[PDB]
């Protein structure tokens, strides 16, 4: 329970800086660029809650004979919207696209949650379900929301492709980890699980943020 606790409180300490750096970052609030820096408030605010809710041992519900973290699939059902949001707004969406796309998200999080909730082998046609979402979220990613993003200015079509890259690279290992972890095959352990996600729920919000602000003043 120790190794679990102390990456709990790892993401938490880790969501809670970016949380701080990001709304100090956007208290100058430009008319335009406010959106921006609420939503990685929310972003790495609402992880950071969830974190703490695990390190304190909440949340921890046994499924067949296995550990299922709720608030780790709570939070991706919240946060995750807010990350395609940032990209949309980042590619310049049209609005139908932008619904096409956050639907195709809340699939994959919603299956991922009752994927991991259910006991029994059917369970693998919800991962299914997601990984074919997710296969929908990629493509637009890289097709429709890149050609999107070029009627920007290069320094905005080069933010949206380098955080496009790192959501699409990092947001592609996670359903591996779901298979190999304890809601799937169960190889890997709950802690060594844990720990790979800690470090892609971390790079995916803070390091996508930080990245963001560094554009944000270059630019
Ligand atoms: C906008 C809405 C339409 C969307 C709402 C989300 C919704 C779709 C989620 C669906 C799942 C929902 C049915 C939950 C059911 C889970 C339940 C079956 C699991 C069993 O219950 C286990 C309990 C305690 O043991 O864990 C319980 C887990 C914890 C109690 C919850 C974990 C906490 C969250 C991860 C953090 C939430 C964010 C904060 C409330 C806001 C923070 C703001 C920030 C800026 C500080
Ligand atoms: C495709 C797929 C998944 C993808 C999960 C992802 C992409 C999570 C990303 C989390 C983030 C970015 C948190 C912040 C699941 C739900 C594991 C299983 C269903 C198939
Ligand atoms: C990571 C710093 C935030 C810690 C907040 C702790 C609040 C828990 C309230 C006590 C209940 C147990
Ligand atoms: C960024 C400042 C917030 C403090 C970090 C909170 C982490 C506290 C870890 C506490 C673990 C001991 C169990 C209680
Ligand atoms: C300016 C730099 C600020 C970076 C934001 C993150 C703050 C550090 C918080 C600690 C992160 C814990 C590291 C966990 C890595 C993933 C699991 C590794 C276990 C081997
Ligand atoms: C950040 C809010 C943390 C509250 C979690 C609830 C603690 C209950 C512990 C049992
Ligand atoms: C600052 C917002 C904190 C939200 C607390 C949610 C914790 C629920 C777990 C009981
Ligand atoms: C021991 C703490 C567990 C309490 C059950 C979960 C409470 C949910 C709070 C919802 C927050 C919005
Ligand atoms: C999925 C989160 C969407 C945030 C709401 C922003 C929409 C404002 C447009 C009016
Ligand atoms: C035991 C439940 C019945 C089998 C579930 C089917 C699992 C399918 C997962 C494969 C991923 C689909 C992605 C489409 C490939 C193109
Ligand atoms: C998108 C590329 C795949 C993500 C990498 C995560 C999976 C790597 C592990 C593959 C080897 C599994 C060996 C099974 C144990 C026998
Ligand atoms: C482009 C493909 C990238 C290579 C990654 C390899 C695919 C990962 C395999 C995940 C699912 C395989 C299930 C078999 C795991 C072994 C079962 C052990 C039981 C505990
Ligand atoms: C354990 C690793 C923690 C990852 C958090 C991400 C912080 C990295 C800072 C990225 C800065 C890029 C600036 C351009
Ligand atoms: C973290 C802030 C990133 C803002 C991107 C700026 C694009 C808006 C154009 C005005
Ligand atoms: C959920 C899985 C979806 C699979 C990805 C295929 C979706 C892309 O499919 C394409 O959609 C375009 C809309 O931008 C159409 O113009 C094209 O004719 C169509 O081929």
Avoid: C, H
Wanted: proline residues 4%; hydrophobic residues 55%.
């Amino acid at each position: 329970m120790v190794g679990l606790t102390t990456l709990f409180w790892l993401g938490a300490i880790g969501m809670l800086v970016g949380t701080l750096a990001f709304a100090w970052a956007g208290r100058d609030a430009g008319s335009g660029e406010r959106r921006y820096y609420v939503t990685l408030v929310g972003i790495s605010g609402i992880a950071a809650v969830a974190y703490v809710v695990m390190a304190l041992g909440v949340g921890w519900v046994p499924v067949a004979e296995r550990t299922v973290f709720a608030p780790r699939y709570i939070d991706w059902i919240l946060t995750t919207p807010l990350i395609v949001y940032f990209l949309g707004l980042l590619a310049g969406l049209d609005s139908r696209e932008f619904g096409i796309v956050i639907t195709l998200n809340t699939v994959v999080m919603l299956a991922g949650f009752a994927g991991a909730m259910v006991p029994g082998i059917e369970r693998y046609a919800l991962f299914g379900m997601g990984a074919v979402a997710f296969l929908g979220l990629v493509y637009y990613l890289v097709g429709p929301m890149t050609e999107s993003a070029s009627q920007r200015s290069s320094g905005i079509k080069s933010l949206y492709v380098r955080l496009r890259n790192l959501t699409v690279i990092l947001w592609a290992i996670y359903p591996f980890i779901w298979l190999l972890g304890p809601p799937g095959v169960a190889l890997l352990t709950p802690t060594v699980d844990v720990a790979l996600i800690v470090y892609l729920d971390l790079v995916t919000k803070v390091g996508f943020g930080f990245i963001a602000l560094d554009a944000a003043a270059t630019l």
